Ligand binder design. Structure first.
Ligand code: MOO
Ligand code: MOO
Ligand code: MOO
Ligand code: MOO
Lengths: 145, 145, 145
C-alpha cells in the first residue's frame, strides 16, 4: 500500500534514539518529527523479532482513548512516562465523549478521546495549554519490512 | 493549583498500605478514602523515582474506558487484580456509549464507560449490584512533590 | 448464574494450547472456538493462582476500545501479539464513536470501538477485509472455579 491504514488516531513516524532492554521488557525511546520525544515499552521478544536498534525508523501507534489530558499537575509527578505539552487545536463533541487534538511544539498533533464532562471541567478551548499523558506500555510499535 | 486537573473520571487519594517491588515492576497497594483497596502496577524505575513507600500519600488515576463492569462472576476467578463491589448510582446514555457510576461501600464513587448494549444486557439500574474490574496495570499513580 | 455477565463486548471461551511462564509474567496461548488463536499476558502470580495449564479451559475478555482495526499493514510488522484477520459484518455509528464487528474465519466475532473518522478513512463496509489488532497484555483471563 501507500501507507499503513490503521484505526488509531495517532500514528507517528520517528527514529529510535535509545533502546533499553531488560530481561522481560524493552523501553524504546523515539524521536518524533517535530522534535517531540515518545517512549514505548514492548516485550523483549518483540524487540528482538522486530530487530530494534537505536537509529532505525519505526512507527508508534496510540489509540485515542489511551491518551489522558492534564492541564494542572499541581506539583504532582506521575508514573506514566510520556507527558507531552501542547496547545488545543480542535475539539469535536459527541454524546458522552469528545475528540480533542493538541498541537505539540514542533508541529506534531495528538488526538485524545475523553468525556465531554472532562472537556468542560478542564476548561478546554482553542489555544489553552494542556499535556497529553500516555503510558509507554500503551504505545504499539511498527517496523517497516 | 488547588488540585490536579486531569481528564480521567477516577482520581482517588489514598495511602500506600504495601509496596511490593520485583526486578521489573512494583505492585502498589493503596488504601482509599472509604476503606476500599486498589492495587496499581508501575515500573521499578517509577517506584524508585517517585520515592514510593508504604505509608506515603498517593493519587491513583483510572480512565473511565479502562473499567469493566461485572454483575455475575458465575464462579469465575479473573486475572485482573481489582474487583470492587458497589451499587449503581448514575447512568447517562450517549449514542453508542454510556457512563456508569457505582458507589462503593465506604463512599468512593467509580465511573466506567461501557457500550449502551452492555448496560442493557447487564440490566443495570439505580441500586443494582455490580463490580468494577480494573487491571492493576491500568492504574497510573501520582505523588505530591 | 447461567454464565459470566460482564460488560466487555468480547468474551471468548477456549482451551490453553500453551503456557509460557517467565519470572515476571506468563504468556497464555488460547485456542478459540472457530480455530482462531489468541494470546494473553498475565502476571506470574495470576498464572499460579488461577492454576493455569496447557489443556485447561479459560475465558478471554477484551473490552471493545482495546481492539484496533487495520486494513493495510503495508509490509509493517507490529509489536502487538494478536493480529486476527476477518471480514466486516456489522457497523453501528454513534456520535464520535462506532462499533465494528468482524467475523473471523471459523465463526468467532470480534467487536471493536473506533472513531467514526477511522471507519470512514479505512473504507469499512460489510464484507471488507480487516484485521483486529490486540495487545496480549490487554486480554483479561477468567478460569471456572
Ligand atoms: O482506533 Mo481509534 O479511532 O484512535 O479509537
Ligand atoms: O459520544 Mo459516543 O462515544
Ligand atoms: O479521561 Mo476520561 O475518558 O474523561 O475518564
Ligand atoms: O465493556 Mo465494553 O466497552 O461494553 O466492551
Amino acid at each position: 500500500g501507500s501507507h499503513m491504514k490503521i484505526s488509531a488516531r495517532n500514528v507517528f513516524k520517528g527514529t529510535v534514539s535509545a533502546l533499553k532492554e531488560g530481561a522481560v521488557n524493552a523501553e524504546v525511546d523515539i524521536l518524533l518529527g517535530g522534535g517531540d520525544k515518545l517512549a514505548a515499552v514492548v516485550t523483549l521478544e518483540s524487540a528482538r523479532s522486530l530487530q530494534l536498534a537505536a537509529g532505525k525508523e519505526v512507527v508508534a501507534v496510540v489509540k485515542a482513548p489511551w491518551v489522558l489530558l492534564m492541564t494542572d499537575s499541581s506539583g504532582y509527578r506521575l508514573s506514566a512516562r510520556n507527558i507531552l505539552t501542547g496547545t488545543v487545536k480542535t475539539i469535536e463533541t459527541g454524546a458522552v465523549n469528545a475528540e480533542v487534538t493538541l498541537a505539540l511544539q514542533g508541529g506534531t498533533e495528538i488526538t485524545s478521546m475523553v468525556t465531554k464532562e472532562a472537556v468542560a471541567e478542564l476548561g478546554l478551548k482553542p489555544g489553552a495549554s494542556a499535556s497529553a499523558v500516555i503510558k509507554a506500555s500503551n504505545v504499539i510499535l511498527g517496523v517497516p519490512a
